[PDB]
């Protein structure tokens, strides 16, 4: 049982969660691979059907119990008929909830128990799963008064194929090459933006054109979709003080609304199943804008506030991204979009883990992740030491479908 | 395979070949990462003995030289007829420069073959163990050209206590604990301070007062030296427009010293071996100043500021903490003391895993400790996927010896 301290305050806990870790990480006793982002049958699937149904009814304070009794013979007669099995929408919930609460590098998981889970297990064809995804983003972005939300599109299974959404948010920006090598727009984007001109989209030329949705139902080639501007509530930005940060043209999506990652419950695996909540505005004013791979924007800000660039110990480039962070957090704010700073946010996650080692004696968290990218040590997650482990139910990263 | 190693910002992949040599083990396991926690014989001592031997042949382009063959024999006799051996001076001071270059948390190591090696291994008392230490100070500090030097006192040996300093760093501020609980000067240092006093310090009653050395040699209680105050450089700490600023009163030192831990040599060891370099800015205008358990300065420069301290997106916490930094840097830089900023320090760095790349194929790093505490994803760290693991020769923490 790994002791955690923490170094601001002296206290210390002990993760016994870590031992239910269930599946293996990257690393080893030789060495740490904790940094890096991507770090690498009817017997198997009942292993995992079962272990989820006791967690389940001991969730609800009735194991052992008959219903739990039911259950379990129910899932392996299932199994046996079918080759696989299908949850209870109960259980779906549940299981959403619980990955998302087991995600190690998620900041916000002090809302877990507040998730809105769309049922879409009965979808067919890429037409149905257009209409689906519009109504989550209608539901999740609330004129501006954003709400977390899941959409479960139906599970892998054998001999079929699956539902995949090839974009890998709901919201994203184009991305074009040009012949002066450079990118024009979201340079995170550029091979979606290809495929999506590949499938039929007839591209734009601006920095904020928000890409279409390649949305592909099994066996069927994926299918272009148009968002209609009306459902995608966008954030120009500006600057409290700063009257000429307006006219840099910049502007951000209000719905975070990640959907290329592969929902796992039970032993069924959900490849389409996309989540959303609201931002940090690190997220957008630190890596969006500043990532030297991203809009890149720094010293642009930085020439426009006259500051020295030329020598690296004038802190020019703090300065400008403190201003970045500065005009998300005014513009979502004076938009009536939720957004979240930093400082709020490592703060919550504080409480979310002193919540979470009473609940169930630890929580997996990575650090590198929790920690924002920048006054990194100006929040308390900074001196709170972590254990990163993997638990399921969970989410994953998958293939690319092509 | 070995690990494979991604930098974000460019796109580029590397492998660690180097981590398949490392010999002692992390704290890391496939079930859990422990990567965030802060601390986690004649057979044994002979392998470690021929690899260290074999290193130093390696530097200087002898492989396999009747040299190379005839040092091995020696060492063998040595640790057969006395189970231990005795380094040559080379030897020494090659070993000194790989434990620095094996640290995985030290963004430093750019500067890593350019190290003083004073030997010291014919020390005998505490007493001369003092003027050992006076002339390193003397030689690093060079009034204000900062140079990187370490003092290796005697290894560790049967039948003989340790010399130890007891002192963190050779240079620390008095941390008096207060009647109310709370502390003045350097909350860090209460236990040293206190140690001090207990051996017959007159402590003084400031927020920067130079604290004593407790240094022990061998089999004796350890015994107290004053530093000669025209020994110690220090900066006042002024910002450059900020002219208040100068009226909190704020000073650090100008030598970065650290003397508890124990250096490690082809299985020599040697508890006692302080090492110095000089600082980067975000060590003294982040962590010492503005953590909330250390000099916790930050809400007082944003009142002080003139900035709204009453919501956290105000980004009131970041702002304060850049212009601390730049004072910092003003202020070594006035004073004409070598001080190298977060962003300068951490271009060096990828410049060294590159020559490391080349060289040994990898380099250990421990990205947490990397990546700077403001600003992070500003620097390109940040987005250098990293392997941390255990080379030695090596620099290790070690119990404190009271
Ligand atoms: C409600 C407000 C939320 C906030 C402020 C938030 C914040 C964040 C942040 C900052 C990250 C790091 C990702 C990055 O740096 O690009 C993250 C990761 C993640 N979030 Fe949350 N999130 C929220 C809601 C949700 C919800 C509703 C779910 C799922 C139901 C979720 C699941 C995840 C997962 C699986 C990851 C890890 C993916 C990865 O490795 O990047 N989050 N979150
Ligand atoms: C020459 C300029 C140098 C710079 C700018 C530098 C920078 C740093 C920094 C910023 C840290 C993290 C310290 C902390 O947060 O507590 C560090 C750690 C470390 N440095 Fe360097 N360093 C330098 C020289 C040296 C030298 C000369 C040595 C040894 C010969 C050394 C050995 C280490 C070690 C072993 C650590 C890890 C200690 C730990 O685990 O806390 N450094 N260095
Ligand atoms: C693959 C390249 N990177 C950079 C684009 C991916 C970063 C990333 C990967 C994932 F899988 C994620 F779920 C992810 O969630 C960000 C997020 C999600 C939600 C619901 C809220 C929020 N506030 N934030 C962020
Ligand atoms: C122990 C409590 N914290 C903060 C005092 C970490 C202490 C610490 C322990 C070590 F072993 C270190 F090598 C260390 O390096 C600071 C440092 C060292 C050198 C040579 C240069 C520099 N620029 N910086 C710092
Ligand atoms: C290499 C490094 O792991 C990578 O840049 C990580 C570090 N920490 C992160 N933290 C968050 N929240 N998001 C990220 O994308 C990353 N990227
Ligand atoms: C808990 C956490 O590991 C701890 O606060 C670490 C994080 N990274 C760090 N990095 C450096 N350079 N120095 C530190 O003291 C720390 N502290
Ligand atoms: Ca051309
Ligand atoms: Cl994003
Ligand atoms: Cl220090
Ligand atoms: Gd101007
Ligand atoms: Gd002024
Ligand atoms: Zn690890």
Redesign the interface.
């Known amino acids: 049982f790994?002791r955690?301290?923490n170094?601001?305050?002296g206290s210390i806990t002990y993760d016994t969660l870590?031992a239910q870790?269930q599946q293996?990480?990257?690393?080893?006793?030789?060495?740490?691979?904790?940094?890096?982002?991507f770090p690498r049958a009817p017997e198997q699937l009942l292993s995992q059907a079962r272990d989820f149904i006791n967690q389940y009814y001991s969730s609800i304070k009735r194991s052992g119990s008959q219903a739990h009794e039911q259950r379990l013979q129910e899932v392996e007669a299932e199994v046996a008929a079918t080759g696989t099995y299908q949850l209870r929408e109960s259980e779906l919930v549940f299981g959403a909830k619980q990955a998302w609460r087991n995600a190690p590098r998620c900041v916000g998981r002090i809302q877990w128990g507040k998730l809105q889970v769309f049922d879409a297990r009965d979808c067919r064809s890429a037409q149905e799963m257009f209409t689906y995804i519009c109504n989550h983003i209608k539901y999740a972005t609330n004129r501006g008064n954003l709400r977390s939300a899941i959409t479960v599109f139906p599970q892998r299974c054998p001999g079929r194929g699956d539902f995949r959404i090839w974009n890998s948010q709901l919201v994203r920006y184009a991305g074009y090459r040009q012949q002066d090598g450079s990118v024009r727009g979201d340079p995170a984007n550029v091979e979606i933006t290809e495929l999506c001109i590949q499938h039929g989209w007839t591209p734009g030329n601006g920095r904020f054109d928000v890409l279409p949705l390649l949305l592909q139902a099994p066996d069927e080639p994926p299918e272009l979709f148009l968002l209609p501007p009306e459902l995608v509530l966008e954030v120009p930005l500006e600057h409290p003080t700063l009257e000429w940060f307006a006219a840099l043209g910049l502007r951000w999506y209000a719905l975070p609304a990640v959907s290329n990652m592969l929902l796992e419950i039970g032993g069924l695996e959900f490849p389409a199943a996309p989540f959303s909540g609201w931002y940090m505005?690190t997220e957008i004013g630190?890596?969006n804008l500043?990532?030297?791979?991203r809009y890149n924007i720094?010293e642009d800000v930085a020439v426009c506030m006259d500051l020295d660039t030329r020598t690296?110990?004038?802190?020019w480039?703090?300065?400008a991204?403190?201003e970045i962070?500065?005009a998300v957090?005014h513009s979502y704010?004076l938009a009536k979009v939720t957004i979240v700073?930093h400082?709020?946010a490592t703060?919550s996650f504080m409480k979310h883990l002193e919540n979470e080692q009473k609940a169930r004696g630890g929580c997996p968290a990575?650090?590198?992740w929790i920690?924002?990218?920048?006054?990194?040590?100006?929040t308390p997650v900074?001196?709170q030491?972590?254990?990163?482990?993997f638990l399921s139910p969970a989410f994953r990263y998958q293939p690319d479908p092509w």
């Open positions: 790994p955690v301290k170094w601001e305050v870590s870790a293996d990480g990257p690393c080893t006793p030789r060495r740490c691979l904790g940094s890096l982002v505005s630190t890596r500043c990532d030297p791979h720094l690296t110990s004038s802190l480039k703090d300065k991204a403190v962070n500065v957090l704010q700073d400082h709020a703060a990575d650090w590198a920690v924002p990218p920048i006054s990194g040590s100006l900074f001196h030491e972590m254990v990163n482990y």
